RNA sequence: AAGACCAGGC
């Protein structure tokens, strides 16, 4: 179902997506 | 230091013999004092241990992370799976008399940092040293051997 | 046949369960600690690095050797490099050991305890021997080393004891119990409603009798029988580790009865 | 930053048992725990000494002169 | 080096108030109705119930240190079942001319009531306690 | 170092407070003891 | 930096006796020995078989403090009754302890196969 | 005597704090009374 | 106030503390270092005339 | 995220469904699915501290939503959700963390002024601060001989990179009293 | 240094390793602890300079501070803390043990005390031995609650010629206190008989708790399983009387006390609902833990903690707070994005409802830094503005 | 408000009593007012006191 | 206190 | 060598 709710153990993926693009350091370079 | 405002220096160091110990040979790397918990609150701390006791035991990473849904009863029954006591405490033997010890330990690994800050680069002793100009007092600072 | 009594439990070539029986607490414990910590052994003690290009540093290898586990067996009849007289070292009571490793297969290249020559005479003796229990036949990765890093040393091992140092004692954990049902009552368990339910039971409940509820607290009782085991690291056979030791504490016990004479 | 030579708390040494675990992983894969027992690591002790470790020194490796 | 007490009380009963080994006990006296007896004890050493037929003694004899066995070849004033030595501190009056006197046995408390050893019961530190079946 | 990068200041009873605004954006524990503290915030 | 050589647990220096035997004034009949370079290993041991010889009066030992490896052990017997001697007694019955030890361990030790 | 009583007074001040929570008193007080202020946070006055 | 009500002096030393529960209250141990380090001006007399000939 | 009532099969929902997620561990399996596309398909959105006065935040993804048509006796009691209004959801509260928290295990178990302490002890333990540092001249570093990850850790530390850069080891504590040293 | 004790003459000892070893008892003057504090020493350099530091500055001068008229260096913890076990009516040791005890104090007059009982074994108590430290002459008596000459509870003090007679031996007995068995060795004996007395208290008790040990973990911070309940239902219903009050309140069916404003006197009450419910949650557990339990024996001794924190840790954390008010509305009119507006219940103005055994929820978590962040504040302010009050 | 107090019996014993505090301060006023007792009057502000009742 | 109540 | 600034310690 490429359409359901989504749990906790997920947000974790989205997270990794976020510095997997923004690292650590975005801020400062940014 | 652990990762909870658990900071303490060493008092002495003792050997594996004169270390207490537990039936399994098992002996404690570090030992601190059961006073640094009750007016520190810190007791994640006390589970941390826990937790990375059955870590130890069965290999997986233990999560320790924020806001989850893992208990300190969960944790518990897991270490019960392993054979050691559900809450942590171990039977030792005084290892100077080798006589069981009338109470339990809390004996479980935990994470410690080696913060910076050994004694001998503080220790600091002088007698009439290099005196300073102006005032013709000693001179400032361990570096410079002040006073 | 006399007086205190073992009776040897499954044992094997890194361990030696047994059962020690009719000797006081007192003794066993001492015995305990002497294999842990008084066994005359063989370590590496000087390292004379010549050349290394590996990304450890000198004295963090050093150590390593320090460590690497070397034959004991004859060890007894060595002496301390202090009571031999001669200056610094020798054959008649030290063991030299080489080391060369050049990077050369383009990936990788290991540094195994296995890799240790002996270039001073052995006399005939076991000693001196990378204890390898490895699988392959290597024990003990030193360290690894890339394209064309180099790394010349030069070890001398020495007798010594787990007192000068950790990186001698031949035993490393051993097992300790007696009386695992709280007859004695030398132990106050932690509980929330059961003690009994909530505290392991231990395997060695087994070669002793239950407690039994309508009997009083024994008192005139004391600590004996102890459920041991001893492991080993190499160096001395697990048997050994438990004779020699068994005999050093005996040898003190002597000089205090012998020093005692000279006075 | 290489393997620890004996477990500091009891002694064991644990020099060889490194290459055994990392491949009784990428290979026969087992998990940790596992394969730490079939190595012969009981207690703890030891048992954190290996399911522990960060090998830098493969990193380190990885530079040149 | 006489004796200084010698009378069978009854269990009246035996309290543990959060003690794993030991309790205070008390009993009436089988002769007067006036003696009557309250007693720390061990009943991990000597264990008692509500209802027994207990003889207490006391007296001092049978002060240096205190030598091991070996005395298995010596007196025994131990013809008993249990044998504490204390001090007993306060002598206070109970009303009437009714007196009894407190004995701490190193930490354990107890107290006598009655008034016949107006000449028997002494105010020293002596005092070996004894007890029976 | 990581830590370090992601600093705070602001030069100078109230300011030092954790407010509620300080949700999310910066991290309620990390913060210099003493001297200079709630002046000195960590994201 | 202030540490001693780790050496200094068992090595006696310079012109000095494991034993060192002085007579006790407190009270009669009485001695305290101090050992050179030792611990509760061999300490306890000798406390211990002491309170065997049921001729001996008295037998405590210590170790003054743990950064230095000595330790002291006080004895007092019967009347004209050594104690020095029941030093030697109680600790020549150890040395037989553990020679039986020694020998019940051997022979049960070729008894196995693995 | 002058020191001592000095510190005497001081000393069990550094144990407090500077909070006036849990009429204006503790550690702001002393200091309040030691300036001998003409207008205290907290005046009030009590009558039988 | 600088360096008159307080300054800086000689003989002195400080190192990090540890409590040990084997000395008299009022004992302080001191690290072989510091002692081999801080002196102390004695006088020469026919008391310890012998024993600072050796000291020296 | 963002929680928009957009279900024409149901109540208020999260934009993001179970089908963005693992399209994204296929991305993450490989090593076009970013970050930038989570934004740029209104599934998520970045509040200031300003807009952030007019929205209504949801904790637990979850939890915070379905229906109700019993509970462990151990967890922490949480409180509920008795509201419909939501515009946005908590990607994790363990993300009001920063670095230094990030690395304290139960930090939501501790005295929450030592978990500040640790917070800045942390900045002076020992390990490894770069791989580069044997060709590095700088004026004082320290490296612990032999690291090790904790036996304990923050799903967070995984962007710390802690695990391989660790500020400590793994001792066998004993909780006891001794020698009194 | 704001104390005449933040300085004193000591006897030298020279010792290895690189640090300056202080006893404990000799703590609390200095204020030191060992997690990396530093300390000063100074060397006298004339003959007279000695003496004057030797005559008047002395450690043992000291015990007795003039500022309290009481002593200022009792027994902390590890000597503190086993003191009290070792005192126990339950508390029994052997011969061989009785022995290397008495060993152990330097004074000993060389002489075995007679067992406190002969019939089977031959043992003794601590309140026995512990007593061999206490020179003759030593007479205290004290009385606590349910206390008279056969204390039930083994409550009170009695030691007469020196020797402990009844009553437990805690804090209160050894401690820094005015009573103090202390405070009276030091008056009736002198500086030195009682500077004497710490290290012999000391040796015996450190090295019986050396065999004894003693620890803590997570399980004495664990509630009964029944207990962990009826708490829970003891904030739900604390809840109600607050859900109550504020239903009495949003219809103007409540009357201002005088001189509160109508909101004000709001506050008032939800603030003394909660602190009373908070206040038996905890209770329910410290009687809940047994004499067994470590944590509460490290209570009890008077070596660390208190009931207060038996309860942050087993029961409910409480409530937080900043300037004196739940934590506010920074928020216009709410406390986090993640609430309703003009919610006034306990749940958003700071209420921690949990145990730290089981965890605080972000929002708890969140508001529980914006009250210790106030504290931090003034112990990083209160700090130098003291000093300066003080110089 | 406690106030301990005089039993005729002589023992002494609880007799709680009524007491009017402000939030502001006035002396030489509010001190000679009908039912007060101007013996026992008190403001924490001292700066007063010593201005109405005399430096001691 | 702070961290415990209003009071506290 | 003196000073200033930042950092960090109880
Ligand atoms: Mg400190
Ligand atoms: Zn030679
Ligand atoms: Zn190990």
Redesign the pocket.
Known sequence: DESAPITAEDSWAVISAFFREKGLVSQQLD | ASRHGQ?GTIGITYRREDMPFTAEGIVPDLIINPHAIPSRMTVAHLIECLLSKVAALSGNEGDASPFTDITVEGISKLLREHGYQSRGFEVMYNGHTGKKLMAQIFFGPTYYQRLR?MVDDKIHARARGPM???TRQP??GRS?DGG | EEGPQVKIREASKDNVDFILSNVDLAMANSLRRVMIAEIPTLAIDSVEVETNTTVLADEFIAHRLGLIPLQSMDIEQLEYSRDCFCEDHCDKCSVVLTLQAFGESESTTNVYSKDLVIVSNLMGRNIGHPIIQDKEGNGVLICKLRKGQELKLTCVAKKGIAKEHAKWGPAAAIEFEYDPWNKLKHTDYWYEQDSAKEWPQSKNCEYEDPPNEGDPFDYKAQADTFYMNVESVGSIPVDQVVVRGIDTLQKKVASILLALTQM | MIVPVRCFSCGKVVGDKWESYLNLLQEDELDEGTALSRLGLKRYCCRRMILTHVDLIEKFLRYNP | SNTLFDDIFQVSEVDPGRYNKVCRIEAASTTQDQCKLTLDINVELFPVAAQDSLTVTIASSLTRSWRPPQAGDRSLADDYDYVMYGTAYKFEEVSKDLIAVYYSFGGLLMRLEGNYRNLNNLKQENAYLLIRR | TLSHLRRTNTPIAKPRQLHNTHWGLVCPAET???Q?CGL?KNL | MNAPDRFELFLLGEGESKLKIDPDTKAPNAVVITFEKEDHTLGNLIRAELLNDRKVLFAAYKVEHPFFARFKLRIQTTEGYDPKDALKNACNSIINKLGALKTNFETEWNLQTL | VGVLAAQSIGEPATQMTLNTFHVTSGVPRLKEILNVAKNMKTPSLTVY | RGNLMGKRVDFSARTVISGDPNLELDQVGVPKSIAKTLTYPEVVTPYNIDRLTQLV | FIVEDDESLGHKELKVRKGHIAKLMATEYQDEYTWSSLLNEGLVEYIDAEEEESILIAMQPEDLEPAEADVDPAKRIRVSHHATTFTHCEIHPSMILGVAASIIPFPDHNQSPRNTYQS??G??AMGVFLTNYNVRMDTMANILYYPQKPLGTTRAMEYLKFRELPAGQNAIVAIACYSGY | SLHKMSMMAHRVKVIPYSTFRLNLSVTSPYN??F????MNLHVPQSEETRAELSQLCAVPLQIVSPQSNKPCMGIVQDTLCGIRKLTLRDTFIELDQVLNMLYWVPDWDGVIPTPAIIKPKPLWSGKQILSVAIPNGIHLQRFDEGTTLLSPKDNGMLIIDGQIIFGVVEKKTVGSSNGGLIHVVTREKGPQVCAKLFGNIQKVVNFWLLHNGFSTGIGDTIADGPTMREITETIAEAKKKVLDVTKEAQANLLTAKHGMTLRESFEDNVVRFLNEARDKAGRLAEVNLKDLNNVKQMVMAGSKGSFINIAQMSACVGQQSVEGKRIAFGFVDRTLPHFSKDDYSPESKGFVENSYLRGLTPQEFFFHAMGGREGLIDTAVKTAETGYIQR | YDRKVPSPTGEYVKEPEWVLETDGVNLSEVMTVPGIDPTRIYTNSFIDIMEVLGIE | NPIWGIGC
């Open positions: 900071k800050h300073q100009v102006l001179v400032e410079r | 210099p003891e003493g200079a000195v | 800045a002890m900045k002076q | 030191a602890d997690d990396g504090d530093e």
